Amino acid sequence: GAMGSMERASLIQKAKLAEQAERYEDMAAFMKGAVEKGEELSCEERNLLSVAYKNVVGGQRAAWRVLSSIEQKSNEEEKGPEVREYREKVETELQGVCDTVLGLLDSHLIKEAGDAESRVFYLKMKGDYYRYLAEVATGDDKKRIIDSARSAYQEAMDISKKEMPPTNPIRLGLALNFSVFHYEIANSPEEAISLAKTTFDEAMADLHTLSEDSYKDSTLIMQLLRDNLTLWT
Amino acid sequence: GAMGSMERASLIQKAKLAEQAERYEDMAAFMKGAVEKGEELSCEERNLLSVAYKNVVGGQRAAWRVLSSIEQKSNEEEKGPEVREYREKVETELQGVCDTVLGLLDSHLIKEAGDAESRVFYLKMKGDYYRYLAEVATGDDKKRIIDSARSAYQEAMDISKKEMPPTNPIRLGLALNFSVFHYEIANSPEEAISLAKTTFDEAMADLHTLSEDSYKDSTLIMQLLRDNLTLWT
Amino acid sequence: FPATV
Amino acid sequence: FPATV
Ligand SMILES: *CC(=O)NCC1CCN(C(=O)[C@]2(Nc3ccc(Cl)cc3)CC[C@H](N)CC2)CC1
Ligand SMILES: *CC(=O)NCC1CCN(C(=O)[C@]2(Nc3ccc(Cl)cc3)CC[C@H](N)CC2)CC1
Ligand SMILES: [Mg+2]
Ligand SMILES: [Mg+2]
Ligand SMILES: [Mg+2]
Ligand SMILES: [Mg+2]
Known part of the structure; x- marks a missing residue:
């Protein structure tokens, strides 16, 4: 170009x-x-x-x-x-x-x-x-258009759950954004809340494996999940 | 266009x-x-x-x-x-x-x-x-380029002093910006400070003539003059 | 507006 | 940076 x-x-x-x-x-x-x-x-x-x-x-x-x-x-x-x-x-x-x-x-x-x-x-x-x-x-x-978003997020989710630990920042950010998709776009607030909560809890349980620097990265995104959950419940 | x-x-x-x-x-x-x-x-x-x-x-x-x-x-x-x-x-x-x-x-x-x-x-x-x-x-x-700025500001100043009261917001804003010109562009910090101080003091003395709303407008720009003076002295 | 990254 | 309007 x-x-x-x-x-x-x-x-x-x-x-x-x-x-x-x-x-x-x-x-x-x-x-x-x-x-x-x-x-x-x-x-x-x-x-x-x-x-x-x-x-x-x-x-x-x-x-x-x-x-x-x-x-x-x-x-x-x-x-x-x-x-x-x-x-x-x-x-x-x-x-x-x-x-x-x-x-x-x-x-x-x-x-x-x-x-x-x-x-x-x-x-x-x-x-x-x-x-x-x-x-x-x-x-x-x-x-x-909504289905195209859903399909891309779902493929990403499927790979992330197979290939990445629950604290991986990419896995966390994906879940954060897919949960927002559910809440704001798909009219699926219960799905949004379930996804955010499950993602948070599974990450919590894997924090013990992390260095201090990885911990900081993961917990920052976990806080965003909690922030959304607070907004929604 | x-x-x-x-x-x-x-x-x-x-x-x-x-x-x-x-x-x-x-x-x-x-x-x-x-x-x-x-x-x-x-x-x-x-x-x-x-x-x-x-x-x-x-x-x-x-x-x-x-x-x-x-x-x-x-x-x-x-x-x-x-x-x-x-x-x-x-x-x-x-x-x-x-x-x-x-x-x-x-x-x-x-x-x-x-x-x-x-x-x-x-x-x-x-x-x-x-x-x-x-x-x-x-x-x-x-x-x-510096002289073009100076000449435009000076023509504006000359008209403003003849035609507008010392509290007029346009007159005040012009003086504010011309004072900055002197300080930052013309390497004339004393001119900058003299202009800001004279403009502030002449405005102060004319505030008595103003409504509450005009007072608010004028004093806001006067505060900017004072802020610059504080920075420069 | 909810958080996204 | 000084104030201008
Ligand atoms: C190679 C790679 O993708 N690394 C992931 C980085 C993790 C840290 N990080 C972030 O936490 C922010 N951006 C982001 C973007 C996308 C995804 Cl899926 C997760 C995170 C950037 C800093 C912000 N304060 C929080 C989000 C950058 C990407
Ligand atoms: C017709 C006209 O020019 N009116 C002057 C307005 C006076 C109030 N005002 C301002 O105080 C701000 N902008 C400004 C711009 C140019 C000049 Cl010479 C003076 C003032 C806008 C609001 C800001 N908080 C302060 C400056 C708008 C113009
Ligand atoms: Mg259109
Ligand atoms: Mg599920
Ligand atoms: Mg060049
Ligand atoms: Mg003079």
Whole structure:
């Protein structure tokens, strides 16, 4: 793409600079360039990719929610088409970012990912970006978008339970996000709560095996599970 | 431009939505569209324009400072051209935003602004965006860029002192920013301090004339003058 | 809004 | 960094 002339290592270096500068759109463009070099990503590189797009789409989602709230209130004086148009503009940009990430995953990150840690990470991301599409979907494809998220999360869950310990941060983060999927997207709050609780309790029982540094990583995500459970119960 | 087909009123409405959504790049694009309709701007519209670009360029300046710091440290192991290249990329985008705002002011906001409040506001903005150019200037034109800022601020100051009371928020904000120009750009800290102190004291003496709401507006900016004075003395 | 990572 | 408006 626009990054085709830049060295892979320079793209990664610049992604790290962009992160320090809180330039997440640039960070994402650099990481997209790096992915498009065609080589597999290391753990650190996978995390740069995820951070960049999480921040970009996170900003878009927050803006979409503000606009959707304003639009909903307007449909409870007539102010014309502008609120819908601008919500649609932000929505279309959001969808474009999601399609970009899903495209990277499909061409060809997932198919080359053989190790559990990489394959679960990418399948989790696939679930996440279909979940963001589902948040804004209102038409004929809504059910299929929801099912695409579910299917990606479920494949990730199946691999994670076979291949990773219950405290592995990727396994924990996957469960956290799939539980949110159940609560917010699939209208399955009991499934959400059961998943969060089971994940927390199984992790608790495996903490004894960990170093101090691994313990810190795992417990941080466990706290997020507890935070959601507190919100939901 | 890209906004040529959108109604002026719709652009303004969308700028306000973009502000609520913290979408400042969109806000700026909408306001640029509105300016390019060719009609003068109301007070509220001038403030939308200024808010939008202040936020866009503010983000760019913060990123540039992070990158420049990293670059300076690298020139105190050799890591190649990437840090300079990426600082240059952000710098060029910053300069582009400044050139866009200065272009709006020159074509044709300033020349149509006859009332003191509008003309001082636009001349202050001209000074501000030349000041941001000066922050990153390192070459042959640095002195001329600094002088362009100074000249715009000075014209604004001259009109403000003739036409506005010492508590007027535009007069106060102009003085605040011109004082910063002196301190940070012109290497004139004594001028900066004298301007801030004189502006504060003359405003203090005119507060008695104000309503409660005007008092709140004026005193907020006076506090910023005091904050700078505290930083500098 | 619930926590995700 | 000093205050501006
Ligand atoms: C190679 C790899 O994927 N490592 C996993 C890291 C574990 C630590 N970590 C995190 O805890 C945060 N991000 C994250 C992202 C995705 C998943 Cl599945 C789990 C965790 C980053 C720091 C935050 N305070 C918490 C989440 C980074 C990834
Ligand atoms: C028509 C017009 O220009 N009105 C001036 C407003 C006065 C109040 N105000 C502010 O105090 C902030 N912005 C600002 C911008 C430019 C200048 Cl010259 C002065 C002030 C906005 C709110 C902030 N907390 C303080 C500065 C908006 C403009
Ligand atoms: Mg749509
Ligand atoms: Mg189960
Ligand atoms: Mg340059
Ligand atoms: Mg003087």
